[PDB]
Amino acid sequence: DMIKGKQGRFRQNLLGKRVDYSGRSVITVGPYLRLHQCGLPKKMALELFKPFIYGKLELRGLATTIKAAKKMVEREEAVVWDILDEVIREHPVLLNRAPTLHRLGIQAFEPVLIEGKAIQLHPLVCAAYNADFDGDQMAVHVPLTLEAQLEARALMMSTNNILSPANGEPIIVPSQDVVLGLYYMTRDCVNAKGEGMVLTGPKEAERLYRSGLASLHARVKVRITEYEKDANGELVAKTSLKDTTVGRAILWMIVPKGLPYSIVNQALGKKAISKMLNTCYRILGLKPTVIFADQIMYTGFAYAARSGASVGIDDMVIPEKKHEIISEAEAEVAEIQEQFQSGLVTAGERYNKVIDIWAAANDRVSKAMMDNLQTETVINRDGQEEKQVSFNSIYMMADSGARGSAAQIRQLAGMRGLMAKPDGSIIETPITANFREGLNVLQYFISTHGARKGLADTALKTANSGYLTRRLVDVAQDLVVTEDDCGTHEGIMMTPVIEGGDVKEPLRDRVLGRVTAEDVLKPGTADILVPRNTLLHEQWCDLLEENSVDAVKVRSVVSCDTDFGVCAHCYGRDLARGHIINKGEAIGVIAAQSIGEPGTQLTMRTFAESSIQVKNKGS
Amino acid sequence: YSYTEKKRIRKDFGKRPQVLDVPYLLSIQLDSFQKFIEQDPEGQYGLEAAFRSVFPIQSYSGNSELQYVSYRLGEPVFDVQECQIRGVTYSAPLRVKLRLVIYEREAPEGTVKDIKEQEVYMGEIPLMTDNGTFVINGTERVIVSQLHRSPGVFFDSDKGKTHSSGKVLYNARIIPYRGSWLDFEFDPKDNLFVRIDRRRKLPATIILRALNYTTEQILDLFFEKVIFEIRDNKLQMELVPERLRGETASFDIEANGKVYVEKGRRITARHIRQLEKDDVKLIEVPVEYIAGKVVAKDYIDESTGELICAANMELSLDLLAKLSQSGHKRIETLFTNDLDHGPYISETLRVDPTNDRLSALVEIYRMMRPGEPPTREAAESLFENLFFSEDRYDLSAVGRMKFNRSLLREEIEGSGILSKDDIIDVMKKLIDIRNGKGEVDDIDHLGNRRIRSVGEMAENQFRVGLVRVERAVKERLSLGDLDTLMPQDMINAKPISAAVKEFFGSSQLSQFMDQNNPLSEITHKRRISALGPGGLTRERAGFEVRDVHPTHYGRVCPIETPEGPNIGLINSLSVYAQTNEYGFLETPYRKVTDGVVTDEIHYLSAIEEGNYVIAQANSNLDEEGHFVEDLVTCRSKGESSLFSRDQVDYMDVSTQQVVSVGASLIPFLEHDDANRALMGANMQRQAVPTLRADKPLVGTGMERAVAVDSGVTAVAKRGGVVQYVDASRIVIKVNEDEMYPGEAGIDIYNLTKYTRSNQNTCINQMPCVSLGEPVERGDVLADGPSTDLGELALGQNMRVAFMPWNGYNFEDSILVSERVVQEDRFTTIHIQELACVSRDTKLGPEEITADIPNVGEAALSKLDESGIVYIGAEVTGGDILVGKVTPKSDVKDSSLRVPNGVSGTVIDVQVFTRDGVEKDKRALEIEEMQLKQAKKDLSEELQILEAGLFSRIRAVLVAGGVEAEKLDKLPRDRWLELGLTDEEKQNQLEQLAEQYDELKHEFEKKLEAKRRKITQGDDLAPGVLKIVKVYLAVKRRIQPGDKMAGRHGNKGVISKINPIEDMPYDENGTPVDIVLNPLGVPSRMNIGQILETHLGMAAKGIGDKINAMLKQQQEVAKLREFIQRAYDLGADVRQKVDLSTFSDEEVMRLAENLRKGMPIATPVFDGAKEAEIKELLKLGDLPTSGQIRLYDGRTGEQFERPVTVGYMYMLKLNHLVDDKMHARSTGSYSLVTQQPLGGKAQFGGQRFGEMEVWALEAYGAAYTLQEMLTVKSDDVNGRTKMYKNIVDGNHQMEPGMPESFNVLLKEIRSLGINIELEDE
DNA sequence: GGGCTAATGACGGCGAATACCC
RNA sequence: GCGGAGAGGUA
DNA sequence: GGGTATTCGCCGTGTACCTCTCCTAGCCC
Ligand SMILES: Nc1ccn([C@@H]2O[C@H](COP(=O)(O)CP(=O)(O)OP(=O)(O)O)[C@@H](O)[C@H]2O)c(=O)n1
Ligand SMILES: [Mg+2]
Ligand SMILES: [Zn+2]
């Protein structure tokens, strides 16, 4: 019993030890931080770094012997805090959050001493940690040896991990306040203060906005000098007059050199900001992306605060035609029930009909509410009137992708749809009321069943997923990229997965970063488009998009020839960094972690075929 | 209104009239334990039942019987408070009256001796406090009610997952309250198997065999007979037509001259009608048809005697021929209709190897006790005691009720033991369901789930103790001599007290009262746990049990349940629900007499609820109990729909009855998603009492119910007038109405000042009333922790603004203004207890003296001569709380020190000495402090009684000659020594003198008793001389990192404290207190916080208006007009408060209390609609939209798009960053695996778990993982070398091999496995 | 207080051990 | 005073 | 006897953290 089992041994005491020089505390926002740092309480920092403190105290001669150093640390005199500041200077600490799902659950930061007893965590990294400031706690470890320090600062530091190891996409994308602020800043309005005035640059745009002589969003012609690296790494300035908002110019001030203006010119929601960061990374590189992300955070926070976005009861508008829709659906259900009691239709048919008419009524009311709420600002230009995408605070939070989806908006302002009873069957009458209105005992009770079932599911799923990912990391642990190139011709034929109606997943992402097994030819023989095994980076993939290549044979890890591990080429590039995999990397654990994190994460997130219809004109 | 209500009335929204008032919320615990004690004649639930169940104890045929008369609960020696102080269990001695009778050995039974014992002592039973808790070792415990399967019989299906070939195999399980279980199940091959509780599955018929039933008797009892007559030739059958239902015809069914059913055509309904009206009884049938049937009776050859065919033998042509030649005219076959009536018992009989009763009993014994040769009497006794012995096997009153209801018998009251008809009926119903004319039961139905409260579980444990002592006494009375011993050497209390103290102390359902909040206490007591004994385990439990059932309506709260691993297995009980006589759950409903909705309330259980159509509470009733709408919304079989006016049988009592108390406290529950409501209730039970709790501006009205029903308030027992008010006691002179005629006196309420709650929070009571105010019975005299004037004040209500403020409220985190800390409103007092124990070692007793080796006099400065800190001294981590020396004699100190990093003031010290040493200083101070108070209380009572006696002496002296000039100027004590003319009056004076003496003598014995109780050594564990306890009190202020929450499920970590100037401010200049993120609303669909903010802004606006009108002190008229217009506010409200009836002084006091903001009361589902909030906002002169324009305190610039501001009631949860925060460099390591300790109490390091290891492996981080694995935790030489190396200013390190691996090697080698570390 | 002795409320998956049908 | 049971809670 | 079903029994069932009580047992002098 001591050996076997979870609690006993190997799992408990030989793969799961309990380190020294470690601490724990509650995490907090700390917006002012740089991406590569973390607020660390003075007293915790002193406790952790005690032996470092003693060493530095003895070197400076402030203490004759080690016991005097201990006594001096236990009094905590000004000299001790000065020594702590000096030793902490470049020493990085590891921050970890309890469910270390993937490798981004542990990251290294440079600490900044602060008052208080809570650890301050940079907002942008919360998404990587799945961290929320609602009582989440984090542990903080101190790498001791010199080798540990280099590893933390080079391999593990927060700024070095911006791309997820699972898929290539960025991890540090702005989450909710940043994206809301940026959205508010970039969206335009038909008529405002400073409508249609011509600005010599973004700098006077800020002059105008901060002085209150122009609205943060108001259509204007501004002269801007964008830079584009079209040559071999040289930047060429093109300077012209664009039609934009004041806000978009103000935002343009931050944007690093290499990027086209177009990037910011749009509404700038969640997707737009994420792809902005993505492009900034692909074009400029790491360091500009880091600094640009920090700038994005700061400007988003600032202008979100200046926006004053709030949520009043009237901000969520009940569609005016809701009551009619509900009365109509009730009349229809009454008619169908009466026509049932006479016995011309079975119970199942009546069930299906009622469920379908109620679903249709729900969609109708939802669409009516979304029309009402979405584009309701009928504000006037100089003369006649016009209509535009509203400034309803709940709508901006929905549309920007900061919080909420259309579904939750429906649950607030529409009817909250159909529910499922224990066995999975759907109740005939739906919950017509919404949270702006009040539910009644029955409707509440039903939604209670829903919520309880979801919470129980999350807990059971969490256990099952934790088991599955544990098995995965176990099986694939020993696999390492050992050789540079095995030199095999074998490979897997990669196609775009076209499930039925359309292209669920295109070629470019499916092939991106894989080396080819053999050269693929143009639609005309002897027209080699890609040499023998080449890593397919964005440029090659785009080139394939320009041509009409349909299927590409790419070297796969399964067919790799290397003994006792895999070779770099058969694997490919994809990493938190951009380049071909480096010899020595443990791909087994990264693969297992990347395949298991979502399953546990998704459960928490949850908390006919009669005729074919060709979608596009073809043979 | 009552006086506490007239002090501060709460504006109540809410349209429907409350017919039933909230019951006493702790009814469950009190009523159950009362039933437990309950000296009662007829043995019902109760200790009495246990005694009568186990007694009378007769010897193993030794003819020495033991009888029970009655029991008495001794008076507890220690009251609740002193018992908590002294760390002992609060209990009562249990005394039972017995008689030992020895009947003559060889005579008609008659006692040759009967001796009656002088109330023999059989151990201690803990008593329950007035509030419904138990003090078990000076800690307040609660015994949570347990939901579990009720005794009876249940028919389950367990389908779908049965061998994956369909074959839904049913089973009937008979579960008693006390006794072994019975199980009948099927198999893929439709053979019915019995399984005694949890063993192997035998063919069921053996049990039928054990019941003395012969095979022919069984086939009679189960199968319907079929008659075969042979008349002149070939097998004619007596046929009952209705039996043919659903049967393809196998032969040509001709009758009375006409073929009716052609051979091959299935019998149709037309044919059925034809044959029925024709009256066809008998039909001749081909022998092929009979060639397959089965024989019922055992037909022997009457002529020769040799048996031919046996009972339940398949028929073959040869057997039919033998039967025909033997002369059998009447053949009895079985009716096996493969559609309806299957051959289930037949096939079991074929598989059943046993034939006689004896072989069946033998097989049973070899299943129960496998391997030992069974002897006849052993098997007989085993089987008899198994299911039919009254003592061993008892179902229950409830078990029998469920059993009889399940088998559709009119009789409800049966015998506990399983009679044979019971078993046969159970198997009949099982095979019945197997044919398909019946439904299986669902375990999750509350009609199938019974609640065992405290008293019942205690009774079970006590019976178990009794069975132990009973076996013991049985043996001792047999072996030992009969007539010498008296009935107290014979009976041992040890097993009884062991079982009872085991249950109360060390049990799964006996757990600490969650005592940091009044709601926490009250909700902990009214809890229903599905865990514990005979309960499903939390981790194992499948979702189906956890999922809410339609039966929970009005019985269990659907939304309040821990969201941890045991979600759904806790289920706090609803507001109005109660427990039945049989332990089920019932909820009140208003009866409906066909048109009018009457006012008589009936409590309905699950089953009774199932039949009727119940109307909702939020149904519109106009002035005469008639529904306004023609089609109203009801529920009939667990599903709601529309029913007609003249169809509803019952109606919900009130909207609140669905939800628990915790959920009922949330305002605007109707607008919160169930998930976030769940989290809101769960957290709200975690709020810590602040220094001055105030009130919710937006409540639900339940606050007073919760505060009063919890024991934290001090409530008047007999109404009167407040005579004396102090911040320790309230003394009230009773009103003459309630005043007892004989020996009344006055009422005294001692309050409790800062004491330690279970969670280390403060429990302090403040007086509400002032000198000379009249109080009525049931008013709130003193406010408990986090309660104000009778109302629950869990947290405090502050001005919040929903906006993102430079990402300091980024995630659920919260921004707070320095004004909140300045006004010191979220600072709580906590209280730690520390204990220093001086035991007796064999090297010599340790000492508590202040002479402590090698400590500087700095440490002693704050210590007295005895070595204990002074009360009121401010200490810090590491300071010496008390001085102790370890004998060797000294040179080493075991003195207790303040734990590292905790600093507060020593408010109290206590000393408990078994030695009772003459001269302990601290003991002297504590004794004098307790004594002087006791003296004061006794002196006050004595002085009042003396004043009364003197008044009576004056009233007698005035008769017989008025003397008022001389008398009034000489002192009163000079009235007894005076005299009067010798008459009856002198006799009355002698009477009063003897009464004076009697009052003195009663005082003296009470004083002596109190002083003996104070002085006595406070019974310590063996080996411990004495113990000194020290209480520290610490004022913890809110700081960044603490957790704050609302009532609606919104959470957060306090992220930053802003200066007052930086915070947003309205035009008027008032800054907000908290800046709360809006983005937490849309995805977390808790809209209740937004409406709460709006209504709170309206309420504080009105309160502000009243403050403005009061500060200028206009006149009573204006205040009355404004407050009346406010209290009315529209119509359809059940308030109708009349300000005019209240006196001007009362109205002025009400304005003073409302000046801080008029409190609203929105009930959960019968709440305040938006329009009413709009009206209230308008009355206060505030924006109707509930949003205000705010100015940025840093920049001064206005925010575009005005923001929602208003007052919301926020709570500081017990999760305090300073408690959470922790770090270590180096410290103590563990013994076996040399890794550093885990935890916070001992320094302890964080656990770098396997997931974290994987994280490091995902990086190329080999050295970090390496050091983390060996140097940081487990490698001894590595850790010490690394400490020295770091101190030396070098960071190199050597890794070595972890000690835990070596432990692993040694442990594996300890098996028979040689595992070696190789070398080459 | 100290000293001495020796029951029942998981479930699935998987692979081995009989049950049985030729 | 290393441990292990039981109970509750946090994320 | 050899292959196919069927019963049978073992093994597993997410991490990190924070509070509290209670711990070899029984009987007699
Ligand atoms: N029993 C549990 C409960 C929670 N957790 C973990 O604690 C976090 C809470 O997520 P959460 O769902 O509470 C908030 P989030 O995921 O960010 O979504 P939202 O903010 O839009 O609401 C998650 O990372 C869980 O993995 C756990 O390991 N075990
Ligand atoms: Mg969180
Ligand atoms: Zn390869």
Author numbering:
A (entry chain D): 329 to 935, 946 to 957
B (entry chain C): 3 to 890, 911 to 1342
Question: Would you copy out the relevant sentences from the publication that reported this structure?
Answer:
The structure of all cellular RNAPs resembles a crab claw, with the β and β′ subunits forming two “pincers” that surround the main channel of RNAP serving as the binding site for the DNA template. The pincer formed by the N-terminal and C-terminal regions of β′ subunit, also known as the “clamp,” has been shown to change its conformation during DNA binding and release. In proteobacteria including Escherichia coli, RNAP recycling is facilitated by RapA, a Swi/Snf2 protein superfamily ATPase. To understand the mechanism of RNAP recycling by RapA, we determined four sets of cryo-EM structures, including the RNAP EC, RNAP EC with RapA (EC–RapA), RNAP core enzyme (RNAP), and RNAP core enzyme with RapA (RNAP–RapA binary complex).
EC–RapA was reconstituted in vitro by mixing RNAP with a DNA/RNA scaffold to form the EC followed by adding RapA. Cryo-EM data were collected after vitrifying the complex supplemented with adenylylimidodiphosphate (AMPPNP) (a nonhydrolyzable ATP analog) aiming to capture ATP-bound state of RapA and cytidine-5′-[(α,β)-methyleno]triphosphate (CMPCPP) (a nonhydrolyzable analog of CTP) to prevent RNAP backtracking. Unsupervised 3D classification of the particles in the processing steps revealed two distinct classes, including EC–RapA (class 2; 10%) and EC (class 4; 36%). Bayesian polishing of particles gave final reconstructions of EC–RapA and EC at resolutions of 3.3 and 3.15 Å, respectively. The clamp primarily remains in its “open” conformation in the RNAP core enzyme, but it closes upon formation of holoenzyme, open complex, and EC with DNA/RNA accommodated in the main channel of RNAP. In contrast, the main channel is closed with the β′ clamp and β lobe distance of 23 Å in the RNAP–RapA complex as observed in the cryo-EM structures of EC (24 Å) and EC–RapA (24 Å) determined in this study.
